[PDB]
Copies of this chain bind each other. A is one copy, B any other.
Amino acid sequence: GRVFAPYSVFKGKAALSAEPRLPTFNRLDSGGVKLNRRGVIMLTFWPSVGERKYDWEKRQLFALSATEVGSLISMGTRDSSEFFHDPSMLSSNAGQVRKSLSIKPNADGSGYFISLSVVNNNLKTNDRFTVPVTTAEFAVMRTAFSFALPHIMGWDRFTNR
C-alpha cells in the first residue's frame, strides 16, 4: 500500500517537499528477484498564493537519483550543486522541457537556497521556485536522505531473515 509521509518546508514564496520512491522489482522465473525501475527521492516545489497558502496546482517535480542523493549528503557548509534533468529524456519529446535544481549556500552560512527552474519550450513557460533551508532543516534532509538511500537502491532487500 501507498505511503505519504513527506518532509516538507514551507517558506515565504514557495514550499518544498521530499519523499522516497521505492524501486520496483521483477520476480525472475529463476525464482530470485531483479531490481527493475530505480528508486529516487522525489522533490516537489509549489508557490505560495495569497498569504501563507500554497497553490498545489502549480507544483513542479524533480527526482533525485541515488548518485544525486549521494552528492547532497556529502555537501559541505560552503558547497553548492546543480543538477539538470530532461523529464522526457530519450523519448520523442526530449529537449522540450528542461529542469535545473540548484543548492547554493546563503551568504550568512545559515543554510542554503534550494531552487527548481523549469523551462518549457512547448508551452512557452519559465517557472522558478526558490526555498530557503536552514542548517537544521538541511540536517533533517541529509539524515533522512541518508536513511533512505539504501532503500531507494533496494539494498534493504539484503537482510538476514
Chain A interfacial positions (CB closer than 8 Å to B): 1-7, 13, 19-20, 22-23, 25, 28, 30-35, 47, 49-52, 55, 58, 66-71, 73-74, 79-81, 84, 90, 94-95, 98, 106-111, 119, 121, 124-126, 128, 130, 134-140, 143-144, 146-151, 153-161
| A101 → chain B closest CB, angstroms | 14
Give 17 pairs: A residue, B residue, CB < 8 Å, sorted on A.
Answer: A2-B31, A3-B33, A5-B35, A19-B155, A25-B160, A55-B95, A67-B140, A70-B138, A79-B107, A81-B107, A106-B110, A108-B108, A109-B110, A143-B149, A148-B158, A156-B159, A156-B160
Please tell me which one of the listed residues B69, B71, B128, B151 contacts residue A158 in the complex, with CB atoms under 8 A apart: B151
| A118 → chain B closest CB, angstroms | 11
CB contacts (< 8 Å) of A70 on chain B: these are 136-140, 143
| A110 → chain B closest CB, angstroms | 3
Q: When the two chains form their complex, are residues A3 and B20 in contact, meaning their CB atoms are under 8 A apart?
A: no
- Most chain B beta-carbon contacts within 10 A, residue among A79, A134, A138, A156: A156
Q: When the two chains form their complex, are residues A49 and B154 in contact, meaning their CB atoms are under 8 A apart?
A: no
| A32 → chain B closest CB, angstroms | 3
